[PDB]
């Protein structure tokens, strides 16, 4: 698409947002200062 | 005054009796039409002087169009069509031997990418180069 | 050489057709120039245009089709005509054979913003007159393509 | 493509109304050879009614079938008014020989025999007769019949005698007959007789028994006869002696037979005395006898099983003219004796109303018990083919709707749908329990429902035969059929969707606007577009001829879109034209403008809409017909949207498109047809103020021109006579870098003439139909559905046809990713939306937005119809 709104996202960036937003959850459930992150 | 364009059309490996049933020869974009006889040859009648693109239209096997220049006097010639640089002449014998080039390719094959295609991802490289910069 | 074309205008409270002679168009076919010789508006015409402007009416122009074989006409919001200080442009469209096709009138600037206009402004006919012959469309460019592909091949 | 054939698409092959048919074939051959009014020669499967080999021809009259004959296994046809004669092999499905003929209007075609076998063809034109060989089509001999400059020849006869009978007449005067010999062709004999009462020979006269000429004379209520073998003077026999009479204001006919050309005709023959009346007469040496009289019988037919002749007679079960119920029975009568056959009666019923059978061709064979078993192909009045088989089960074998060959207009109709907070919570929780129960419980036009994606619509099709169809857009089946009585072939139609299916309390409603060309009177038919039945809302009677119609987006209370018509007196008629409707459109009157394009005078007029339902001359332009005739008035589709108002030009800047919603694209041709002086003009006349935005004229070009008008751009394909090549020319309308009037667009408030970008491309093939791909929101890229004569549907991307493609790539172009300008447009076979489903003689391409945003529904209509 060319005129598509920028607010529409493909799979890769959605996965990136998912992986960005889950570190806090990891610390919440797994335990404090878990090693699953991205630095 | 009125002339006829003769020719033939054969598809390699397929008898005419199998494909001529639904094939038409078109002289200058449906402005003149003709039908191939049993043997595979074709004849188009009632053609005035000028230039005409002859194409054997057949859904089974495509045919290369050929330009034919017929004059008022009666002499007439065949050549390869070229809508760009139309002044050129590439002679082709008049009894058009438009052999087919096999069935056309209306369909497009599935992608079916393999792991070897996944190996060299431009996105992966372009996003791992900053990873190496961050490490160093 | 030169042909004179009548040009009538009309504007009424009821927005009907009351075309009246306004100006003569001198179309010189040789050099392709058109010149108009109009009379300035009068008080009643100015007044009539005022109510037409007040009621958001239309200002219609009409010329004979040939130098009484017909007419080609158009219209323009007279209130937009009066809110533009009587500044407009009329384009005369003809065909390839040199026959009148149409007349298009448009003010400058267009539209309206509720600008009150005094009477003294309407004593001049700021009119830009143009003639528009049919513009020949360009054909496909082949010479550039063949030469460019020749350079690519070599 | 993607090799998912048949998953979503469907094609139906339709031939036109069956002008000439041939049923005589081997019982195992199971073939019908039919030539239709659509210039199509096809073979139909006898068992199921399907195409075996179909050969379409030129759409114009220059390939019209004029006469068909069958011999053995190859069918012989004449086309172009006797100019070409061809022999088609019915088995293979191809030609056997194609021969051009000389000038002269063809009048009669026949075969000849030497002694026992037919081997040559006698074809007669108004001034000459010609013989052609069966084996190769080589011309045998041509003879100019004497005195033919005055006489008009009407029939040709020959048989095993090795001679040729030629007959000509002069209206209300004497007639002449010539005897030729098949061996040479010289005039063996020539006679003349006086027929003062005779009008014409083919329609009225006939020839039975041993070449005995029989002209029915209604002046004296008699049967003038001439024993043409020996008699030189006509003889007369009144029908009163045979207890027969002719009708009033009707031309009686005589139907002979000839089982094979070599043998003489059967003595018995039919006589059409009066409509719904026939007689069987057996001529025997100067006298005739009535074999059987068939009253109140519509159609009769003859057949031969090899030795005996069989007559099929058609009549309804009980007459009520017309017929009680469309139940027609066909009975077999022996021709040797006028006796009805036993256990051969067939009975069928026509589904439509107001339609009566028109053509009947029967094919006979010997049953196991030597009983004559026959089948009947009957074409109704509304261009419908029925195949009837003798056995009671499935009295119709294959019903073919050939009428759909010529579709005028079609539309796609969506399928029908499948204060206190405490009350709100109560109903919401109740709904929750209802849904839970429905989920836990999980442990055809009757049930028609809209799809989830709205991808399955229903097509309402209009056919110039005056027939309305409802075809499921997914499977291609027909859901409802309706007929409009008394619809002329040249009538102009207009179909409008007044109310869709999104108003469940209200029935869906569509309006079709037909206009007879000859009379000029137009009528409105309102029907449910889902079920097909006429709505009970009586449409208004359009007394005056109308000129144009508008579908205003304003809707009535029942969500019916207001429709406006402009009559001949330039008045406006509304529909439903209620008080609310009248008030709404009277209050919104000055914002409604009509434009009428009189192509005959080359005039364009634009009218206002007054408060009191009257029109006034707002603007008027005249393109002189003496140098230019208007050929296309393509305006932009009203039901489209534009997503990006402007476009990114790179540079971090934007270029604004010239979105004028009232922009006509009138395309006119040059009345000068010379190959060197022809031109095609395109004017971007405004629809409201009448201003010509652009007045381009391409020189040295000729039609036909296929133009698509879209959101902003227009693309018109044309022929280039100078270079002999189809060429495109894309016109894109662009505003300045900043928009003039944003909030809203008014055609009266555009003093800035939009800039035009032009580019001419070369198309390496012809064209038959074009239409841009349309999406709901216009987000999806635009594609042109190029209709090639071959039948394919090229999907050309609009981004390719950009006029801004530079001739030399630059950094700006690379930033904008503009391809360098290439005058050649490819026709890559991979772009076709159809693989081999070619649509022969393509007429139009309809594109529907459908649901979603990436899928556009496509219906290519022409001879075949494909979706
Ligand atoms: C008539 O009115 C127009 C509009 O006001 C005048 O055009 C303007 O001309 C000045 C220069 O003199 C430009 O700066 C403006 O941008 C123009 N405005 C436009 C084009 O809308 C015009 O000069 C006036 N007179 C004549 C004789 O045409
Ligand atoms: C010709 O048209 C037919 C009908 O649309 C296509 O259908 C089938 O396609 C598959 C593809 O694998 C073939 O295996 C079948 O034999 C086809 N059935 C037929 C021809 O009856 C077919 O693919 C089309 N052929 C081409 C070359 O486009
Ligand atoms: C004729 O009778 C049949 C059987 O009752 C019925 O279905 C049909 O609608 C009737 N009318 C017509 C015009 O076919
Ligand atoms: C457009 O024109 C109207 C007058 O026709 C004016 O009121 C308005 O401000 C202009 N601009 C926009 C963005 O609407």
Short mmCIF file of N, CA and C in Angstrom, two decimals, chain A residues 1 3-4, chain D residues 643-644 779:
data_model
loop_
_atom_site.label_atom_id
_atom_site.label_comp_id
_atom_site.label_asym_id
_atom_site.label_seq_id
_atom_site.Cartn_x
_atom_site.Cartn_y
_atom_site.Cartn_z
N UNK A 1 0.82 -1.20 0.00
CA UNK A 1 0.00 0.00 0.00
C UNK A 1 0.86 1.26 0.00
N UNK A 3 -1.00 4.79 0.24
CA UNK A 3 -1.72 5.82 0.97
C UNK A 3 -2.20 5.33 2.32
N UNK A 4 -1.80 4.13 2.72
CA UNK A 4 -2.25 3.56 3.98
C UNK A 4 -1.76 4.40 5.15
N UNK D 643 -8.53 8.70 -1.07
CA UNK D 643 -7.94 8.60 0.25
C UNK D 643 -6.99 9.77 0.48
N UNK D 644 -5.95 9.85 -0.34
CA UNK D 644 -4.93 10.89 -0.22
C UNK D 644 -5.37 12.07 -1.08
N UNK D 779 -8.15 3.29 -1.01
CA UNK D 779 -6.81 3.07 -0.49
C UNK D 779 -6.01 2.18 -1.43
#
